[PDB]
Amino acid sequence: AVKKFKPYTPSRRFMTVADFSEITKTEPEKSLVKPLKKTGGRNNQGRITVRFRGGGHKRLYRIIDFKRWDKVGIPAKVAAIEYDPNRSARIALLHYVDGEKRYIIAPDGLQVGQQVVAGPDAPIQVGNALPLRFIPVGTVVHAVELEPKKGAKLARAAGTSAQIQGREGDYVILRLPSGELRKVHGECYATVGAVGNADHKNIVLGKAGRSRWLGRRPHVRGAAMNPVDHPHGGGEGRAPRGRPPASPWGWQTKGLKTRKRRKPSSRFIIAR
Amino acid sequence: MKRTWQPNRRKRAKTHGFRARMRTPGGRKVLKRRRQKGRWRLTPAVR
RNA sequence: AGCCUACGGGCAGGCGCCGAGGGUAGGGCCCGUGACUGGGGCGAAGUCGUAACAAGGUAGCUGUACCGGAAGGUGCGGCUGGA
RNA sequence: CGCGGGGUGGAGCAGCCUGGUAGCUCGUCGGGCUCAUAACCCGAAGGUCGUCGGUUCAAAUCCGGCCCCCGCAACCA
RNA sequence: AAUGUUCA
RNA sequence: GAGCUAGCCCUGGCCAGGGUGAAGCUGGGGUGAGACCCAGUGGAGGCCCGAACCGGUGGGGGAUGCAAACCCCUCGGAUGA
RNA sequence: GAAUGCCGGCAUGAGUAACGAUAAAGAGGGUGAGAAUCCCUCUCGCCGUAAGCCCAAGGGUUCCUACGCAAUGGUCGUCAGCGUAGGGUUAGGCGGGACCUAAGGUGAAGCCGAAAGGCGUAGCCGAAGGGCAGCCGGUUAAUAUUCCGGCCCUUCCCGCAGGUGCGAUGGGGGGACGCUCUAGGCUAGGGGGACCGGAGCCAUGGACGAGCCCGGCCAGAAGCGCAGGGUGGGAGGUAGGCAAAUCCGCCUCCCAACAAGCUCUGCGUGGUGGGGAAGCCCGUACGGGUGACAACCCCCCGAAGCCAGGGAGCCAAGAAAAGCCUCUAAGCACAACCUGCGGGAACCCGUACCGCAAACCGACACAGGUGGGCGGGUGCAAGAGCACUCAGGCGCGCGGGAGAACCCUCGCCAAGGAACUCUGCAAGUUGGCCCCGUAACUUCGGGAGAAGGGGUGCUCCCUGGGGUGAUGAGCCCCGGGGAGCCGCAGUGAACAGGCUCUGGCGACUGUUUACCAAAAACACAGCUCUCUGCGAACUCGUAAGAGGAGGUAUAGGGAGCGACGCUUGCCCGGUGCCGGAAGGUCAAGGGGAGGGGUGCAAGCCCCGAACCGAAGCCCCGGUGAACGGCGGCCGUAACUAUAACGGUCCUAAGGUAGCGAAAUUCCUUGUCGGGUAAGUUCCGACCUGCACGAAAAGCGUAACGACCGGAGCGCUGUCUCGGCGAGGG
RNA sequence: CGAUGUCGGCUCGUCGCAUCCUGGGGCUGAAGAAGGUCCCAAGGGUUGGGCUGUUCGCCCAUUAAAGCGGCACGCGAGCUG
Ligand SMILES: [Mg+2]
Ligand SMILES: [Mg+2]
Ligand SMILES: [Mg+2]
Ligand SMILES: [Mg+2]
Ligand SMILES: [Mg+2]
Ligand SMILES: [Mg+2]
Ligand SMILES: [Mg+2]
Ligand SMILES: [Mg+2]
Ligand SMILES: [Mg+2]
Ligand SMILES: [Mg+2]
Ligand SMILES: [Mg+2]
Ligand SMILES: [Mg+2]
Ligand SMILES: [Mg+2]
Ligand SMILES: [Mg+2]
Ligand SMILES: [Mg+2]
Ligand SMILES: [Mg+2]
Ligand SMILES: [Mg+2]
Ligand SMILES: [Mg+2]
Ligand SMILES: [Mg+2]
Ligand SMILES: [Mg+2]
Ligand SMILES: [Mg+2]
Ligand SMILES: [Mg+2]
Ligand SMILES: [Mg+2]
Ligand SMILES: [Mg+2]
Ligand SMILES: [Mg+2]
Ligand SMILES: [Mg+2]
Ligand SMILES: [Mg+2]
Ligand SMILES: [Mg+2]
Ligand SMILES: [Mg+2]
Ligand SMILES: [Mg+2]
Ligand SMILES: [Mg+2]
Ligand SMILES: [Mg+2]
Ligand SMILES: [Mg+2]
Ligand SMILES: [Mg+2]
Ligand SMILES: [Mg+2]
Ligand SMILES: [Mg+2]
Ligand SMILES: [Mg+2]
Ligand SMILES: [Mg+2]
Ligand SMILES: [Mg+2]
Ligand SMILES: [Mg+2]
Ligand SMILES: [Mg+2]
Ligand SMILES: [Mg+2]
Ligand SMILES: [Mg+2]
Ligand SMILES: [Mg+2]
Ligand SMILES: [Mg+2]
Ligand SMILES: [Mg+2]
Ligand SMILES: [Mg+2]
Ligand SMILES: [Mg+2]
Ligand SMILES: [Mg+2]
Ligand SMILES: [Mg+2]
Ligand SMILES: [Mg+2]
Ligand SMILES: [Mg+2]
Ligand SMILES: [Mg+2]
Ligand SMILES: [Mg+2]
Ligand SMILES: [Mg+2]
Ligand SMILES: [Mg+2]
Ligand SMILES: [Mg+2]
Ligand SMILES: [Mg+2]
Ligand SMILES: [Mg+2]
Ligand SMILES: [Mg+2]
Ligand SMILES: [Mg+2]
Ligand SMILES: [Mg+2]
Ligand SMILES: [Mg+2]
Ligand SMILES: [Mg+2]
Ligand SMILES: [Mg+2]
Ligand SMILES: [Mg+2]
Ligand SMILES: [Mg+2]
Ligand SMILES: [Mg+2]
Ligand SMILES: [Mg+2]
Ligand SMILES: [Mg+2]
Ligand SMILES: [Mg+2]
Ligand SMILES: [Mg+2]
Ligand SMILES: [Mg+2]
Ligand SMILES: [Mg+2]
Ligand SMILES: [Mg+2]
Ligand SMILES: [Mg+2]
Ligand SMILES: [Mg+2]
Ligand SMILES: [Mg+2]
Ligand SMILES: [Mg+2]
Ligand SMILES: [Mg+2]
Ligand SMILES: [Mg+2]
Ligand SMILES: [Mg+2]
Ligand SMILES: [Mg+2]
Ligand SMILES: [Mg+2]
Ligand SMILES: [Mg+2]
Ligand SMILES: [Mg+2]
Ligand SMILES: [Mg+2]
Ligand SMILES: [Mg+2]
Ligand SMILES: [Mg+2]
Ligand SMILES: [Mg+2]
Ligand SMILES: [Mg+2]
Ligand SMILES: [Mg+2]
Ligand SMILES: [Mg+2]
Ligand SMILES: [Mg+2]
Ligand SMILES: [Mg+2]
Ligand SMILES: [Mg+2]
Ligand SMILES: [Mg+2]
Ligand SMILES: [Mg+2]
Ligand SMILES: [Mg+2]
Ligand SMILES: [Mg+2]
Ligand SMILES: [Mg+2]
Ligand SMILES: [Mg+2]
Ligand SMILES: [Mg+2]
Ligand SMILES: [Mg+2]
Ligand SMILES: [Mg+2]
Ligand SMILES: [Mg+2]
Ligand SMILES: [Mg+2]
Ligand SMILES: [Mg+2]
Ligand SMILES: [Mg+2]
Ligand SMILES: [Mg+2]
Ligand SMILES: [Mg+2]
Ligand SMILES: [Mg+2]
Ligand SMILES: [Mg+2]
Ligand SMILES: [Mg+2]
Ligand SMILES: [Mg+2]
Ligand SMILES: [Mg+2]
Ligand SMILES: [Mg+2]
Ligand SMILES: [Mg+2]
Ligand SMILES: [Mg+2]
Ligand SMILES: [Mg+2]
Ligand SMILES: [Mg+2]
Ligand SMILES: [Mg+2]
Ligand SMILES: [Mg+2]
Ligand SMILES: [Mg+2]
Ligand SMILES: [Mg+2]
Ligand SMILES: [Mg+2]
Ligand SMILES: [Mg+2]
Ligand SMILES: [Mg+2]
Ligand SMILES: [Mg+2]
Ligand SMILES: [Mg+2]
Ligand SMILES: [Mg+2]
Ligand SMILES: [Mg+2]
Ligand SMILES: [Mg+2]
Ligand SMILES: [Mg+2]
Ligand SMILES: [Mg+2]
Ligand SMILES: [Mg+2]
Ligand SMILES: [Mg+2]
Ligand SMILES: [Mg+2]
Ligand SMILES: [Mg+2]
Ligand SMILES: [Mg+2]
Ligand SMILES: [Mg+2]
Ligand SMILES: [Mg+2]
Ligand SMILES: [Mg+2]
Ligand SMILES: [Mg+2]
Ligand SMILES: [Mg+2]
Ligand SMILES: [Mg+2]
Ligand SMILES: [Mg+2]
Ligand SMILES: [Mg+2]
Ligand SMILES: [Mg+2]
Ligand SMILES: [Mg+2]
Ligand SMILES: [Mg+2]
Ligand SMILES: [Mg+2]
Ligand SMILES: [Mg+2]
Ligand SMILES: [Mg+2]
Ligand SMILES: [Mg+2]
Ligand SMILES: [Mg+2]
Ligand SMILES: [Mg+2]
Ligand SMILES: [Mg+2]
Ligand SMILES: [Mg+2]
Ligand SMILES: [Mg+2]
Ligand SMILES: [Mg+2]
Ligand SMILES: [Mg+2]
Ligand SMILES: [Mg+2]
Ligand SMILES: [Mg+2]
Ligand SMILES: [Mg+2]
Ligand SMILES: [Mg+2]
Ligand SMILES: [Mg+2]
Ligand SMILES: [Mg+2]
Ligand SMILES: [Mg+2]
Ligand SMILES: [Mg+2]
Ligand SMILES: [Mg+2]
Ligand SMILES: [Mg+2]
Ligand SMILES: [Mg+2]
Ligand SMILES: [Mg+2]
Ligand SMILES: [Mg+2]
Ligand SMILES: [Mg+2]
Ligand SMILES: [Mg+2]
Ligand SMILES: [Mg+2]
Ligand SMILES: [Mg+2]
Ligand SMILES: [Mg+2]
Ligand SMILES: [Mg+2]
Ligand SMILES: [Mg+2]
Ligand SMILES: [Mg+2]
Ligand SMILES: [Mg+2]
Ligand SMILES: [Mg+2]
Ligand SMILES: [Mg+2]
Ligand SMILES: [Mg+2]
Ligand SMILES: [Mg+2]
Ligand SMILES: [Mg+2]
Ligand SMILES: [Mg+2]
Ligand SMILES: [Mg+2]
Ligand SMILES: [Mg+2]
Ligand SMILES: [Mg+2]
């Protein structure tokens, strides 16, 4: 239900806004254990590391429950679907029968007023978390942990999802969103189902102002610089790079792989 | 137009203050040299 | 401010609305013409190739899509106006 | 004017570097196949090597001088 | 495994 | 040495006055149900004209100047990067 | 005797330029030795969303008063922001600190680093932010929300009096938050008034009249009244709020669903306190007295301000901690906490003055720059614009003459209107509001203020809506209709688009070379390639560590192209990148065939070939939205001409689509056609592209542009071709 | 080279003659007019536009003529850029 605008002014006929119908009447956030002061910054102690960062609207970091093994066997009731400006996906407010209030990365199809649980039993239903060794092979899963007892770290973006291909001893083969086949331990929890907000890929920023609102500064091309500032820079009008394309630091940016060859995690990867 | 000197008691006392000099070896050597030379004002006068 | 034959009237005259036409400006239809360009019809004996009619020597035709000096070729699907 | 590459049968290319013998394709001529042409098959002719010289016993081949053709360069104020 | 100028 | 300047961080402030009338709502129309069409309502946008404000397009003057970047006329933006 | 030598002094230009905005001065009197320049008075000119008031930064004696003018003041100066001396800045309520946290800084624990030192959860510091109890008048020459007067508050400490289990830096709530648009009632502010209060006035032809002119408020506890914000109330169970709670949270019933009720603001009213014009008389450098027993009332407009944490829409999703309430634990229930009343205690710093400027920043009394609040009245539709003008403040610290050239700024002009010139550069036309009326084209929004027009003042009469008013008079907004008057001219002055046609480039709003370039350059949404499995890739750092990111392939880094429509062809021979457990080579190392130097000797010391030896290179493949490249010579068609066609050489392949004398074309003002009287420019075509061409993108495209080129219309001193006048020199 | 500002235009001229015109003259294949060529002569005059930065040049309408050249390819302490 992607929202479109009329061409009453330029940069609007193409501007696109995501559908906010899934967001229930819960515009304000929660507290006691919820958004904390988010320290916005574009650099480390001193100089800038990640270039072209800054500006952007002010935000509050919604603390999410990535390690859902803290309340094993305890049910929960989905009471709301909120907006998180720090993530591409939607968050969900949970009210455990136990008494706590934590946010889970709202998966796709998860509606308000639904029971959810995490643990060994944990019936196979959208939103439930189980160890990978318990989930049936061929089911879509998200929020997978890399190593056990380290929190959810894989397939947690808008619309992303992983699939179980098979088991091997204490490890299970997972088809990550990038198509890479990975061996993940069986004790790593993972929330079954997709993530949702698949329309996030169809959104169109429209104008540069929307990019500035998101905190993305105008990226300057290397060819539009000087040789002191970039390897492609310099030369007379529109030089065709005159050399293999490279980054401002020298390393090439066209097919040059940069993964550490001698890595202990190499014997766990099967695909690209 | 706007010139380079825009007085500020706060900035002047924090950037050229006596405590700031003692915090770094550079400022310490600055005070050392000024003492050796016999300066009447080892640090900028701030009221 | 005039003239009158019956004058709380008329005439001449003055002002106003409309008003043919002229001017200004901008649209709509049609007609002629225009360097150049597109394909078309016709034109006894010009060049290149063989597409089709006999399984025309790759069955032919067709809608579409792409490519090719050119007929045309190929892909997808359809037809018997073929076996 | 300058720099470097080429002038070879009728057409297009080698052969030059390391001198002795000029080959490839097309084309032309004669004869085959066809009813006739093309295609194809069998034989053969065809070259003052741009020219003027000199080095050698000897020059397409090596060295000079001119006649053409091809490309590059002709900037600074 | 191509082709057969024009009219009768 | 970032009391100028460039960028970023935290915290505050400012932007007179006019227009254009997007979405959405309500009613009516339409259909088997819709799409959709009319009004009325509604006030969106790096929207429009134009002050404060931020600039610096073209001309003139200034040239041991008012000024080691100025003054006059004109000009761009002016709820947004 | 020279070095554009150094330091100092004095010459020249020279009594020349200038004397710092063209807002403006004139006169009488006084002081004084000396007044254009100091003081007073009268006339005149200027500002007035300021050139007027109030804070903040900065400045530091500049403020007041007395006595002075050698120097500072662009002249004088009796004057001063200058010298000498004296005086002057009063706080529990204003601001900051004995309160809080943010960026950030620091930093016990801890980590890192040759040393210096770097990082770092807790805590600490860290302020126009949070929290927090004062309003109105009088006084000095100089201080006031500080002193005084009135009224009203806040902390503590000690007591009594009544209640409750009190009780923590601990748990919970709360504090607490975006942008835009708005509702109801108020208040600030302002307009009017036949009502009220006033010293006075009849001028010059008329006016004793609802005549003229001035003024008709401020604050104010409880108690009221009017708006408005917050807030559901009980009974059970509970595993969570890192110990425990009656508190919070989660379930299950019963009543509210409402502001009904509790508190909490704002505003009127209120015991009472204060102020009170214009004019005249005075002596000031200025204020005093009277005016006064002042009166202190009624309408209308009305905020951007208040009730505030109000409401609604939207996406980009909008600080923390303390104060505050509540809950319980240690310990203690002789303690303690809440309320009322008494008595008592309440510190440290600033307070003068300038403060859009002569006191700050610019070496200067510099036409420059400098944050926040108030910023009135009338009219022009509106308004912080414009013109004039309250309050208030100035005439800019050299003047007096004259009426040349010439210069700046400004006005007007016969006839012609771009003939000027690189170009209509400049200047001129137009110009606001209301109503008609608007084309090709298009992304259906636009283009559109298209273009081109008409009305615009004043008077009289008739008539329709509202708002405050009781369904009414008035008062304030909006209209409509008909008669008439004047002038050359009715947004009668000031503020206020010239317009169209057609190309190049760029999609567009934006950004940049402060101090010569604002663009076709950069950026931009969007497309594509590539890398990156999370201790990610990349980046800063020797490291620790941090950013990425408290993000996870719809995410993040790099690169190119730059909306959008249609597209983006061939070559992997070379370079790069990617994939290849084969093979060649390949250093340290293993390894010892064999040899050497010394010893009488065991020995010790050297070299040292086979063979095993990674990366890398060679080798084998892929990959162009990777770096790059994408032919030559001949002949041919039944008029010529050209070549659909063929031959041959080479290459890795031999530029297709779409454009083309173009931001690209040397020859070149190529050749035709159009605009013109005439056109090296411009526009449309031809194609012979020296030397376009497909993401250093190609061909187009509505809209957009202080970009660049051409044309036309309207208009004009640009010009023929000058002339006159105004002010500043 | 411890500086001689270099194109073109505007303003201001001035000079040379081997003269565009006007004045005088001689031949002519000069009947006359109108021409051709040559000699003497500069006193004076030698237009306005379109294109281009132009000098130059090509056109438009004329003219008695629409001359050539020097003066730092005259002239920027005169201007334009
Ligand atoms: Mg809390
Ligand atoms: Mg830090
Ligand atoms: Mg630091
Ligand atoms: Mg870019
Ligand atoms: Mg550059
Ligand atoms: Mg640098
Ligand atoms: Mg650098
Ligand atoms: Mg480089
Ligand atoms: Mg450069
Ligand atoms: Mg180039
Ligand atoms: Mg380059
Ligand atoms: Mg009668
Ligand atoms: Mg056939
Ligand atoms: Mg067939
Ligand atoms: Mg066939
Ligand atoms: Mg094919
Ligand atoms: Mg088929
Ligand atoms: Mg050859
Ligand atoms: Mg050869
Ligand atoms: Mg034969
Ligand atoms: Mg040079
Ligand atoms: Mg050079
Ligand atoms: Mg044939
Ligand atoms: Mg700064
Ligand atoms: Mg700063
Ligand atoms: Mg508005
Ligand atoms: Mg509507
Ligand atoms: Mg609006
Ligand atoms: Mg705007
Ligand atoms: Mg605009
Ligand atoms: Mg504007
Ligand atoms: Mg303001
Ligand atoms: Mg500024
Ligand atoms: Mg700028
Ligand atoms: Mg300017
Ligand atoms: Mg410009
Ligand atoms: Mg200028
Ligand atoms: Mg000058
Ligand atoms: Mg404009
Ligand atoms: Mg604007
Ligand atoms: Mg000497
Ligand atoms: Mg000397
Ligand atoms: Mg000198
Ligand atoms: Mg000298
Ligand atoms: Mg002298
Ligand atoms: Mg004199
Ligand atoms: Mg002189
Ligand atoms: Mg003089
Ligand atoms: Mg003078
Ligand atoms: Mg002055
Ligand atoms: Mg006297
Ligand atoms: Mg301050
Ligand atoms: Mg101060
Ligand atoms: Mg003093
Ligand atoms: Mg004084
Ligand atoms: Mg005195
Ligand atoms: Mg003096
Ligand atoms: Mg003295
Ligand atoms: Mg003096
Ligand atoms: Mg001075
Ligand atoms: Mg005296
Ligand atoms: Mg003094
Ligand atoms: Mg104390
Ligand atoms: Mg504090
Ligand atoms: Mg604290
Ligand atoms: Mg603190
Ligand atoms: Mg901190
Ligand atoms: Mg140490
Ligand atoms: Mg540190
Ligand atoms: Mg810290
Ligand atoms: Mg403190
Ligand atoms: Mg504070
Ligand atoms: Mg505060
Ligand atoms: Mg206070
Ligand atoms: Mg005072
Ligand atoms: Mg007071
Ligand atoms: Mg008091
Ligand atoms: Mg208690
Ligand atoms: Mg307490
Ligand atoms: Mg009032
Ligand atoms: Mg009144
Ligand atoms: Mg009265
Ligand atoms: Mg009288
Ligand atoms: Mg009041
Ligand atoms: Mg309850
Ligand atoms: Mg507990
Ligand atoms: Mg209610
Ligand atoms: Mg009151
Ligand atoms: Mg009250
Ligand atoms: Mg009084
Ligand atoms: Mg008085
Ligand atoms: Mg609200
Ligand atoms: Mg909090
Ligand atoms: Mg604390
Ligand atoms: Mg409370
Ligand atoms: Mg103390
Ligand atoms: Mg004071
Ligand atoms: Mg004060
Ligand atoms: Mg101010
Ligand atoms: Mg000043
Ligand atoms: Mg100053
Ligand atoms: Mg000073
Ligand atoms: Mg000073
Ligand atoms: Mg002055
Ligand atoms: Mg100014
Ligand atoms: Mg300002
Ligand atoms: Mg106002
Ligand atoms: Mg006003
Ligand atoms: Mg009027
Ligand atoms: Mg008004
Ligand atoms: Mg107006
Ligand atoms: Mg205001
Ligand atoms: Mg004004
Ligand atoms: Mg006054
Ligand atoms: Mg005239
Ligand atoms: Mg006239
Ligand atoms: Mg005209
Ligand atoms: Mg002209
Ligand atoms: Mg013209
Ligand atoms: Mg001319
Ligand atoms: Mg021109
Ligand atoms: Mg032009
Ligand atoms: Mg102009
Ligand atoms: Mg006018
Ligand atoms: Mg238009
Ligand atoms: Mg147009
Ligand atoms: Mg329209
Ligand atoms: Mg109009
Ligand atoms: Mg009138
Ligand atoms: Mg009212
Ligand atoms: Mg009413
Ligand atoms: Mg009229
Ligand atoms: Mg106007
Ligand atoms: Mg144009
Ligand atoms: Mg062009
Ligand atoms: Mg642009
Ligand atoms: Mg384009
Ligand atoms: Mg722009
Ligand atoms: Mg610049
Ligand atoms: Mg510069
Ligand atoms: Mg400029
Ligand atoms: Mg610009
Ligand atoms: Mg695109
Ligand atoms: Mg660093
Ligand atoms: Mg490093
Ligand atoms: Mg990190
Ligand atoms: Mg992070
Ligand atoms: Mg990416
Ligand atoms: Mg990216
Ligand atoms: Mg580009
Ligand atoms: Mg299109
Ligand atoms: Mg390509
Ligand atoms: Mg290749
Ligand atoms: Mg390769
Ligand atoms: Mg290969
Ligand atoms: Mg490799
Ligand atoms: Mg070895
Ligand atoms: Mg060894
Ligand atoms: Mg190897
Ligand atoms: Mg022929
Ligand atoms: Mg061929
Ligand atoms: Mg091709
Ligand atoms: Mg062409
Ligand atoms: Mg070209
Ligand atoms: Mg023509
Ligand atoms: Mg032409
Ligand atoms: Mg053309
Ligand atoms: Mg190109
Ligand atoms: Mg390319
Ligand atoms: Mg482009
Ligand atoms: Mg194009
Ligand atoms: Mg266009
Ligand atoms: Mg522009
Ligand atoms: Mg355009
Ligand atoms: Mg003139
Ligand atoms: Mg004159
Ligand atoms: Mg004058
Ligand atoms: Mg020189
Ligand atoms: Mg010299
Ligand atoms: Mg002569
Ligand atoms: Mg003659
Ligand atoms: Mg004669
Ligand atoms: Mg004759
Ligand atoms: Mg003669
Ligand atoms: Mg020349
Ligand atoms: Mg001459
Ligand atoms: Mg010359
Ligand atoms: Mg010259
Ligand atoms: Mg000059
Ligand atoms: Mg010049
Ligand atoms: Mg000179
Ligand atoms: Mg130039
Ligand atoms: Mg210029």
Author numbering:
A (entry chain RD): 2 to 273
B (entry chain R7): 1 to 47
The authors write:
During protein synthesis, ribosomes select correct aminoacyl-tRNAs (aa-tRNAs) by monitoring the nucleotide (nt) pairing between the anticodon of the tRNA and the codon on the mRNA in the aminoacyl (A) site. Decoding is thought to be governed by a conformational transition in the ribosome—open (off) to closed (on)—that occurs upon codon–anticodon pairing in the A site. Ribosomal ambiguity (ram) mutations increase miscoding and map to disparate regions, consistent with a role for ribosome dynamics in decoding, yet precisely how these mutations act has been unclear. Here, we solved crystal structures of 70S ribosomes harboring 16S ram mutations G299A and G347U in the absence A-site tRNA (A-tRNA) and in the presence of a near-cognate anticodon stem-loop (ASL).
The base triple interaction between 16S rRNA nts A160, C342 and G347 is disrupted due to h14 widening. In the corresponding near-cognate structure, G347 and C342 form a canonical Watson–Crick base pair similar to that observed in wild-type 70S. Overall, the structures of 70S-G299A mutant ribosomes bound by either cognate or near-cognate ASL closely resemble each other.
